[PDB]
């Protein structure tokens, strides 16, 4: 299991070797180590090390995994890169200490390659309709409190504060904003088994579109949660989440 202060000090001392060349013999030991640097700052690689590391996640503990070594983005040979570093760091190195380290780090390379794997996926990404949906939940929820109780204002608030509902509208956001955050990797286990969570929302679309055909409310905030809640964005958001509700054991 890569543990975080590993790939921290790999990624300050990786940095670190990569300024002390110019462009001799760097226009590729750099343009390499640059690949790296990124990928180990990336929001999503850091993600990836925060599951693995609080969920033990490994190829044979979670062999469902296996099916991101293939398809696009698999061999696309960066596998070579990790491990060719340190034979050529090697000559710059000058301490018996992070020389060891760095062979021992480039478990990684597995992680690395799922990371090239979902990178690719992530670049296909539709377009989030907003930014807040957490937000618009509950400016939407104060108004409808703010009003005579309708039989669907009662199931939608109480749907609306559902956890695994309140957890897709956070994550909605962590990922539409491109903002990661430990605190949002444990909601993961909060939004619960997916059936329920994408029934439970296509409920919550239902009891929208009836408030606002029977004009009485009448935001444009049930129309806009309706709209976040049927974008294919946070569609497949869901998607992602059913298949990592698979592959590791989160409830």
């Known amino acids: 299991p890569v543990r975080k202060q590993d790939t921290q000090r790999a990624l300050h001392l990786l940095e670190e070797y990569r300024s002390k060349l110019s462009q001799t013999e760097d226009r590729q030991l750099r343009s390499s180590i640059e690949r790296v640097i990124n990928i180990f700052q990336s929001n999503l690689f850091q ?18 995994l296996e099916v991101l070594f293939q398809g696009p983005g698999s061999d696309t040979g960066l596998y070579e890169l990790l491990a060719a570093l340190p034979a050529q760091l090697q000559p710059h190195v000058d301490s018996q ?45 104060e108004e409808l409190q703010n009003k005579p109780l309708n039989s669907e204002i009662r199931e939608l608030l109480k749907l609306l504060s559902k956890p695994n509902v309140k957890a897709l509208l ?10 990661y955050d430990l605190e949002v990797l444990f909601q993961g286990p909060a939004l619960g088994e997916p059936v329920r969570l994408e ?9 929208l579109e009836k408030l606002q055909r029977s004009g009485e409310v009448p935001p444009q905030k049930l129309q806009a949660l309706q709209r976040v ?23």
């Open 47 to 64: 993600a990836l090390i925060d599951i693995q590391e609080f969920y033990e996640v490994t190829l044979l503990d979670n062999p469902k």
């Open 97 to 141: 200490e992070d020389l060891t380290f760095l062979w021992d780090m480039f478990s990684l390379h597995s992680l690395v390659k799922i990371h090239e794997k979902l990178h690719y996926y992530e670049k296909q990404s539709p377009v989030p309709i907003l930014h807040g949906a957490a937000a618009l939940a509950d400016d939407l929820a």
């Open 170 to 179: 956070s994550v909605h956001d962590t990922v539409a904003q491109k903002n």
């Open 199 to 207: 029934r439970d929302i296509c409920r919550a679309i239902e009891l």
């Open 229 to 251: 809640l049927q974008s294919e964005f946070c569609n497949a958001v869901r998607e992602v989440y059913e298949h990592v509700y698979e592959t590791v054991d989160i409830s």
